[PDB]
Design an enzyme around this catalytic site. Sequence first.
Site, PDB file in Angstrom:
ATOM      1  N   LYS C  10       2.538   4.021  13.963  1.00 11.38           N
ATOM      2  CA  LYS C  10       1.923   3.274  12.877  1.00 11.38           C
ATOM      3  C   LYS C  10       2.798   2.088  12.484  1.00 11.38           C
ATOM      4  O   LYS C  10       4.028   2.178  12.450  1.00 11.38           O
ATOM      5  CB  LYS C  10       1.688   4.186  11.671  1.00 11.38           C
ATOM      6  CG  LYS C  10       2.081   3.584  10.331  1.00 11.38           C
ATOM      7  CD  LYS C  10       2.097   4.634   9.235  1.00 11.38           C
ATOM      8  CE  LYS C  10       2.787   4.110   7.988  1.00 11.38           C
ATOM      9  NZ  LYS C  10       2.760   5.104   6.880  1.00 11.38           N
ATOM     10  N   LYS C  15       9.174   0.568  14.929  1.00 13.54           N
ATOM     11  CA  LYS C  15       9.023   0.525  16.380  1.00 13.54           C
ATOM     12  C   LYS C  15       9.820  -0.625  16.980  1.00 13.54           C
ATOM     13  O   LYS C  15      10.481  -0.466  18.011  1.00 13.54           O
ATOM     14  CB  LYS C  15       7.546   0.389  16.753  1.00 13.54           C
ATOM     15  CG  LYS C  15       6.700   1.615  16.474  1.00 13.54           C
ATOM     16  CD  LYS C  15       5.223   1.295  16.643  1.00 13.54           C
ATOM     17  CE  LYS C  15       4.848   0.016  15.911  1.00 13.54           C
ATOM     18  NZ  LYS C  15       3.474   0.078  15.346  1.00 13.54           N
ATOM     19  N   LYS C  41       1.753  -8.717  15.250  1.00 14.23           N
ATOM     20  CA  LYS C  41       2.752  -9.285  14.348  1.00 14.23           C
ATOM     21  C   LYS C  41       3.662 -10.267  15.075  1.00 14.23           C
ATOM     22  O   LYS C  41       4.116 -11.254  14.485  1.00 14.23           O
ATOM     23  CB  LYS C  41       3.579  -8.174  13.704  1.00 14.23           C
ATOM     24  CG  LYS C  41       4.345  -8.623  12.470  1.00 14.23           C
ATOM     25  CD  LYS C  41       4.749  -7.444  11.605  1.00 14.23           C
ATOM     26  CE  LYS C  41       4.417  -7.691  10.145  1.00 14.23           C
ATOM     27  NZ  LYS C  41       5.504  -8.429   9.450  1.00 14.23           N
ATOM     28  N   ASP C 128      -1.367   2.081  15.307  1.00 16.82           N
ATOM     29  CA  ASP C 128      -2.028   2.474  14.068  1.00 16.82           C
ATOM     30  C   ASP C 128      -3.492   2.816  14.317  1.00 16.82           C
ATOM     31  O   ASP C 128      -4.075   3.647  13.612  1.00 16.82           O
ATOM     32  CB  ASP C 128      -1.896   1.362  13.029  1.00 16.82           C
ATOM     33  CG  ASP C 128      -2.639   1.669  11.745  1.00 16.82           C
ATOM     34  OD1 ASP C 128      -2.009   2.192  10.804  1.00 16.82           O
ATOM     35  OD2 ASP C 128      -3.853   1.379  11.674  1.00 16.82           O
TER      36      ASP C 128
HETATM   37  N1  ADP Z   1      16.716   2.723  11.767  1.00 13.19           N
HETATM   38  C1  ADP Z   1      16.373   2.081  10.624  1.00 13.19           C
HETATM   39  N2  ADP Z   1      17.033   2.311   9.468  1.00 13.19           N
HETATM   40  C2  ADP Z   1      16.703   1.680   8.327  1.00 13.19           C
HETATM   41  N3  ADP Z   1      15.707   0.782   8.231  1.00 13.19           N
HETATM   42  C3  ADP Z   1      14.961   0.454   9.313  1.00 13.19           C
HETATM   43  C4  ADP Z   1      15.260   1.103  10.598  1.00 13.19           C
HETATM   44  N4  ADP Z   1      14.386   0.606  11.492  1.00 13.19           N
HETATM   45  C5  ADP Z   1      13.595  -0.282  10.836  1.00 13.19           C
HETATM   46  N5  ADP Z   1      13.935  -0.368   9.538  1.00 13.19           N
HETATM   47  C6  ADP Z   1      13.289  -1.244   8.530  1.00 13.19           C
HETATM   48  O1  ADP Z   1      11.865  -1.206   8.638  1.00 13.19           O
HETATM   49  C7  ADP Z   1      11.333  -2.503   8.363  1.00 13.19           C
HETATM   50  C8  ADP Z   1      10.094  -2.784   9.200  1.00 13.19           C
HETATM   51  O2  ADP Z   1      10.189  -2.126  10.460  1.00 13.19           O
HETATM   52  P1  ADP Z   1       9.476  -2.769  11.750  1.00 13.19           P
HETATM   53  O3  ADP Z   1      10.318  -2.451  12.962  1.00 13.19           O
HETATM   54  O4  ADP Z   1       9.107  -4.200  11.436  1.00 13.19           O
HETATM   55  O5  ADP Z   1       8.101  -1.932  11.819  1.00 13.19           O
HETATM   56  P2  ADP Z   1       7.239  -1.831  13.174  1.00 13.19           P
HETATM   57  O6  ADP Z   1       7.629  -0.489  13.728  1.00 13.19           O
HETATM   58  O7  ADP Z   1       5.801  -1.909  12.728  1.00 13.19           O
HETATM   59  O8  ADP Z   1       7.709  -3.007  13.995  1.00 13.19           O
HETATM   60  C9  ADP Z   1      12.437  -3.499   8.673  1.00 13.19           C
HETATM   61  O9  ADP Z   1      12.547  -4.452   7.614  1.00 13.19           O
HETATM   62  C10 ADP Z   1      13.708  -2.684   8.775  1.00 13.19           C
HETATM   63  O10 ADP Z   1      14.647  -3.106   7.780  1.00 13.19           O
HETATM   64 MG    MG Z   2       6.786  -4.157  15.335  1.00 11.06          MG
END
Ligand code: ADP
Ligand code: MG
EC number: 1.18.6.1
Lengths: 121, 121, 283, 272, 522, 477
Positions: C10, C15, C41, C128
């Site tokens: 999700k 990710k 994104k 998602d």
């Molecule tokens: N291992 C982690 N520890 C703490 N915060 C995290 C970690 N991984 C991601 N985040 C936080 O989650 C937020 C969004 O994650 P993101 O990777 O953009 O989501 P997606 O999985 O949809 O790409 C980021 O701003 C980041 O600071």
């Molecule tokens: Mg992403």
Amino acid sequence: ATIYFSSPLMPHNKKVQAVAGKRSTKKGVAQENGVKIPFECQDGNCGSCLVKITHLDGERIKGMLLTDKERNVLKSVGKLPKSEEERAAVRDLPPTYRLACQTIVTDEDLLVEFTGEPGGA
Amino acid sequence: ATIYFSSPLMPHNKKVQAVAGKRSTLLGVAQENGVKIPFECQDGNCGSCLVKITHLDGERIKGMLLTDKERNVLKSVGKLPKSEEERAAVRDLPPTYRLACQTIVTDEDLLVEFTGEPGGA
Amino acid sequence: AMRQCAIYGKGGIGKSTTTQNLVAALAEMGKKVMIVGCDPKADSTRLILHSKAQNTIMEMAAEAGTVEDLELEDVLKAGYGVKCVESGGPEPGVGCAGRGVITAINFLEEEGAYEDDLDFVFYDVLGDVVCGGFAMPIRENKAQEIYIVCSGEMMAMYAANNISKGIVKYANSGSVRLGGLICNSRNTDREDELIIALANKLGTQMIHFVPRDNVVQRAEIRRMTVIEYDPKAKQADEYRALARKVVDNKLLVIPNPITMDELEELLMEFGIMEVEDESIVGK
Amino acid sequence: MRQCAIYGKGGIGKSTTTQNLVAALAEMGKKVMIVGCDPKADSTRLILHSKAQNTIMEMAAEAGTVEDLELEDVLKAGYGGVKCVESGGPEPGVGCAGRGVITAINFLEEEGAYEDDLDFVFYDVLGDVVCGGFAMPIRENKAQEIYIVCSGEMMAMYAANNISKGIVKYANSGSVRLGGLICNSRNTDREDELIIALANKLGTQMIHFVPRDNVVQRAEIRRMTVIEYDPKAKQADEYRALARKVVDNKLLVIPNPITMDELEELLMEFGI
Amino acid sequence: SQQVDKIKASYPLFLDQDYKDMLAKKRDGFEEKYPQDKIDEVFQWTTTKEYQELNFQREALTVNPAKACQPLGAVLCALGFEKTMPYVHGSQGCVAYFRSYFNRHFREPVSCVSDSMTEDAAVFGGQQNMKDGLQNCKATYKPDMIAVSTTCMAEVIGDDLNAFINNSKKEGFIPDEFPVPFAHTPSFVGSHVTGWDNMFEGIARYFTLKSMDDKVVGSNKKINIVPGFETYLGNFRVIKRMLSEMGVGYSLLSDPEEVLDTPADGQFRMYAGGTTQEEMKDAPNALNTVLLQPWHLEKTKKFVEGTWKHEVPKLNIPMGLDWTDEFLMKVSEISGQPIPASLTKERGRLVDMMTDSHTWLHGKRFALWGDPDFVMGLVKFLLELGCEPVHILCHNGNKRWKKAVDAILAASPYGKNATVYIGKDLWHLRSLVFTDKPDFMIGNSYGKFIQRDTLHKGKEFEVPLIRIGFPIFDRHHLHRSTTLGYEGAMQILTTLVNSILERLDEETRGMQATDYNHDLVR
Amino acid sequence: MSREEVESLIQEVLEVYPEKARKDRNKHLAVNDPAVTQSKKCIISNKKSQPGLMTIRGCAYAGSKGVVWGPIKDMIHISHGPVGCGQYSRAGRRNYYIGTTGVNAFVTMNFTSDFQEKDIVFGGDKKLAKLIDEVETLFPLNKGISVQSECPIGLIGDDIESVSKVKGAELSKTIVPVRCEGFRGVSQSLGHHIANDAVRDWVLGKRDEDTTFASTPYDVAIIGDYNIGGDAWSSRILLEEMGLRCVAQWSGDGSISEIELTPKVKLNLVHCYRSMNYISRHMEEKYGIPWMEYNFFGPTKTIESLRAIAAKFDESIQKKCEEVIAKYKPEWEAVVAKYRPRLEGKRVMLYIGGLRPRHVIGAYEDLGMEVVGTGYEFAHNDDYDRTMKEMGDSTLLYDDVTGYEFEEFVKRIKPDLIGSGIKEKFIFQKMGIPFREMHSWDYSGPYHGFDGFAIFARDMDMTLNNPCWKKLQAPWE
Ligand SMILES: Nc1ncnc2c1ncn2[C@@H]1O[C@H](COP(=O)(O)OP(=O)(O)O)[C@@H](O)[C@H]1O
Ligand SMILES: [Mg+2]
Ligand SMILES: Nc1ncnc2c1ncn2[C@@H]1O[C@H](COP(=O)(O)OP(=O)(O)O)[C@@H](O)[C@H]1O
Ligand code: ICS
Ligand code: CLF
Ligand code: SF4
Ligand code: SF4
Ligand code: FES
Ligand code: FES
Ligand SMILES: [Fe+3]
Ligand SMILES: [Mg+2]
């Protein structure tokens, strides 16, 4: 050479058999079969005969020459993007939009779409 | 029957010869020639095999039966105007948008266009 | 010599960061890895290329007219020793949002980026919702090993269940298998054991559990992976362990999806949701 | 640089109003460019003092193709340092009448006549029909501001409504906005507030009201524009005020079309 | 492998063992070649009489023709005028091929221009092409005259040059007083000689049709000479020398020998010599006009008789003894000047050379081909030497020419076996020389492939070739020789007798086998 | 070097032209900048020639019949139309072959319809059918027929495709109609494309259902080498000595069977991009056969191409390539040692249309010679993209140069040698500049490979250093 004419004005798409390479253009083929493509000039400077050509046999695409007059007319009605102009200049491949009075029939299967309006909306 | 498969995913449209009326549908013809129409079910209810079929020879249009399953799937996808439903119900004429898994090849020249997405945007 | 892997989950759980850190850890072992961001994104190559945003394949095809004229060099960008590409997506409201993925992978396969000159190919895919485009790498046998990122949240494990349903649906026509479950901390007390039980129900394992570290934001503020920012931090050690166990992963099973009531009772079992009773429905 | 277009039906004083606008703007030290998107070759006769400026289409036909055309022969400078471009159409019945506009805009962009520190560009476009090369500035997002010249006549208001519909159609694809409604008088009763009511009905604001007088014709005989024919004229100062309101205009809105019965009732209840 | 001291070209580098093995591997592996026995059998079949009958039953296919198209002759005619640019309204490939052909024959630069007509001109005509080409050529290469001919493309689509040139002149592309003669030279009618005739008639009509009021025959007391399609510089030189020796005022029309023989001195002369426009204007003031090759100059004969009011003599080409004598006597009768003693001495020397070499020339069988006038003159001369023509070929001959040659052969006891063929090609001649073997062939370089063919059958079946005609590609500077007059007859006699003697010497070189006839004195 | 005065020289040469001709010709003359990867911003090519300026270009018929289809030996090529077109192109190109001429090989032959006026007026197709019947009667050992159409065939209106289909079905033999009319295309460039399309549509897909050919993992195919003076054999011997097996040659000394068997090949070796890139791309899309460009001009380029080709196979092929390089090192080293001192530091101008000018530049530089100007009559923009890196800085680039322009450039620059075709050979031989016929190798050769490098060096030494060039001026002048 098989040509399929299509138009919203035509109730049915029309299939014709044509002889390739003739001095008479696609306009000759259209006029012999009674396909009402607007031809409003005898020098190929207007855009009335604008059509959209689709090569149904993608493997059997024949290299051609895009004449300078036809290129300028196609650019004048905004139907020739830069990428297709470069493709015609380098690879000698036809663009998607052509002029019926300047289009030479090739030995392939073609779909000619027209809307009954002159080129340039 | 001559079928021209066209798609923005395919670099070139392909021309294939098919046996008309086969129990295997347009989907069999697509699979045996490597045309990647997304098939995602086996009961004909997903609608992911939606294609747009154009009869290039307007004279040689063959009457067919639009089954209720196809009609309901096309309505659930939205590719079925009321006018085309009335035409298919009264004059037994096929609609513009069909399902490849449920479409039987007829003895004519066809152009089959797909975008690579499941039916319903 | 090529292991095709995808990361699903999700949107909003991590990710992209987990994928980029895994690739960064893999590149330390001399492996050559390539990243495909199948998420609209378009930020899954941020921490590797050090750039504001990698130009998407759809953006290049729109500015150039068609995808056939597109080159590999302007599409494939080499940073940290690993290649990066972005699928992008169409304008929100028209077409299918996953269509960019279908445009990207196809293009890549015709240009030669899919030739086995690489040890690892990874697809950061939005999970998602499972539709065309986002399920194309599963439907077209383009991802051997799927890893699902999940938190101690109802929506995250619902998405894991949906992705496993897609996998088992496409299990008889290809070799697409579920390699494990990755847990990212949401500061939940019982989330580790929760997703342990979820994986046991699904017939799969945890590859690893990732702690929530504030140094990941400090790494992203430089547009940098946490491995490069502190090679000596414990978050980098956790990411390296996750990478080594991803390499050493040999359990590829067809998952066993659970129902909604089973998920509800699994949430109940570990205290995330209170006990429901039938006699206290009308008050 | 601000790109503005002047639309409306043919015969409503569009060309001379645009010419007075640009000459007044040039009086203030601004530098302006004129592109005449009207098939009639009269959009730039009052600022160059010529019988008829030679059009781009005519030169392209006489010089073989447009690739042999040079910028110096098509860009003529007039009073106040104004740059003048004239886009003639083809003969009646020979293709689209709007090919000239497309060819001229493409040529101007290719030869780089816009970036030369210009501040105002004005496209004098025919508004009888919105199609082909006449709707091209709206289609291609060429003119960010558009002003419609109308009067208290059914044809003019219908043309304004049609241009508003054309703006609405391409509103989402670019920043093309209808700035206001220029009103030209034909010495008829109760016209100013009729046009104010139309503008308020379709969301814009009236810019300025231009009365009819004989001084503009006396200047027209001399191939002369009104302001630099006689700067102390009352109509010259009215044109100056119109220019001031145009340059200091900040209201850009998306109009809403009005139906045929709405326009009919608006015309009827105002005494005409 | 190459030795740096003895570097080998293609021959005999490709005769090494490794190259032979490579070619054998290629042939055996990936060529699907027919067995050598089948190839030999079919080759032996091709040399039979039944294959000759099948070959002569041809009506649609022509193999190895012996003629070219009209604009080649048009360009050759146009090159003979002072500062005249040949212009070919049509495609550019025609001009490229003409220039390559003439460069390969004469080994001299050839200047010609084309309007480069294309698909656009195929659809909408070539008016703009003509205007732009005329303007560009005049501005760049600065000619005093532009001579316009047509390509088959321009002939099929019905492009008329008169209206195009008048439109170009009246719209300001070229000055109104600039001379632009034109001619229509379709490639599907006749051959290159017909194009030469058409272009010369066009130029003469351009310069003389509208000024026939003050022209009186004999005013300038000169004799006009029209050479025709001539590719020998010596043929122009000998005519000039013989006419100047008699003290006869003359005017050579369309003589390109000057531009086709420019010296190499660090400068490139794109124009050199040629007949001036004044001599073309004063042409109808001459006492008479003589056509050197009348069989391909008929249309210009009609123009000269009808318009110039000149009684054109009925003369053959000045080849041989009798025809040169007739030409000299007719010129003396027209001009009133006696034949001097130098020409009598030259004729006596020719007769002496004929008597000295009559032993080796008698009874020799010849298969010859070329142009109608040249072939007729060659057959006549061969008849005067006691030689026996056997296969006479003319791909661009007509029924009247064939009848004339038959009449010429009938008036000599050496023409019984001789047979004339019109419309036949070089494959027909190969069949003829295979089934009815002559001693030698006489023609252009295209006959060399026939000789090789005969050599494949056997050494005793080989028919050697003598290179007299157009075009000669495999030899150098043979275009400098002469064929007309006593000088040309002397050169032809020397070539024939020395070819016969060289063949005899070759046949008797084997020691203890045939060297008993390897005589020192012949 | 010295880009400013060559710019001013271009300006002076372009002064005599009319305004339109000057404006067009200004786009085709450029000053080389090696740091440019997109020539489209510096030079423009593949445009129509200005009327009446003595261009050197030919027609599409020359680029199809005389270039691509002509070298094929066991097929019969009918020049459909008037006689002259096939007459002037007969045996003018030295594409070498092995075969019995007139029995199983027909390269130096001239088969033509020989159209007359009655053929121009009344059809002409039945004449084509009768011609095919006569060809089958008199030449039974041919393995195919091609019909190369000339200018009037399209103009009068003819369907050679239906005749080809009908007669091929009736006689069970492939008939390939080629609409290579002269007016189609601005130069020979479109003739290559038309011939490639004809091969793709009528020949290439013949052996698709056949699997009787035993293919090995070292199979290759030489594409774009037309065996001028034996060039293709000199490349073939090097390729075979490297451990590769070549089954096809396109099209010098080629056969119908090689063309049909080409789709069963593991690697396409493309020598001439301009003439066969279309068929190479088609065979890559359809059959998945990769293709690369190689250069066998001079020792350095030959070694580079050999190593690049070996890099696409296993280690044994690389070892064999090292063996052949070591074997042939002393030969070309001795040639260089003998001939470089006589040719060191001499400037050359080149003008050959198509691939040869970029390719020859490495062979020239191997003997210490410097190319100061170059150009192609029919090359496209990708060719100019490829050649800008090869050429030196501030050197002259021309495209479709006219006679006057080339003569003025040669007089101003005064090079020591000019390599070009027959149409300009005698022009520059009059002015006292040594000249080499690059298109025909001045009836010498081959020039490809190590065996050809020696002949190349010997020819250039014999022409540049000939004493005749010192006697142009009379002693009393
Ligand atoms: N291992 C982690 N520890 C703490 N915060 C995290 C970690 N991984 C991601 N985040 C936080 O989650 C937020 C969004 O994650 P993101 O990777 O953009 O989501 P997606 O999985 O949809 O790409 C980021 O701003 C980041 O600071
Ligand atoms: Mg992403
Ligand atoms: N303010 C004004 N007062 C009086 N007459 C005017 C005024 N504005 C325009 N006109 C008249 O209206 C006519 C409109 O013509 P013009 O403005 O040249 O082109 P268009 O027909 O496109 O408006 C002119 O001939 C002019 O005489
Ligand atoms: S085919 Fe071309 S003009 Fe590539 S038409 Fe031409 S035998 Fe030239 S520079 Mo004559 S593109 Fe070959 C050529 Fe080069 S005939 Fe030969 S020499 S390498
Ligand atoms: S561009 Fe090419 S070579 Fe030229 S004609 Fe056309 S196909 Fe042929 Fe042959 S026949 Fe003579 S030379 Fe021409 S004018 Fe008629
Ligand atoms: S298939 Fe999924 S992603 Fe595509 S349009 Fe439908 S819901 Fe959206
Ligand atoms: S779009 Fe408008 S200008 Fe163009 S042809 Fe149609 S009506 Fe005329
Ligand atoms: S009819 Fe005018 S361009 Fe064709
Ligand atoms: S495959 Fe799902 S509806 Fe056809
Ligand atoms: Fe010479
Ligand atoms: Mg006006």
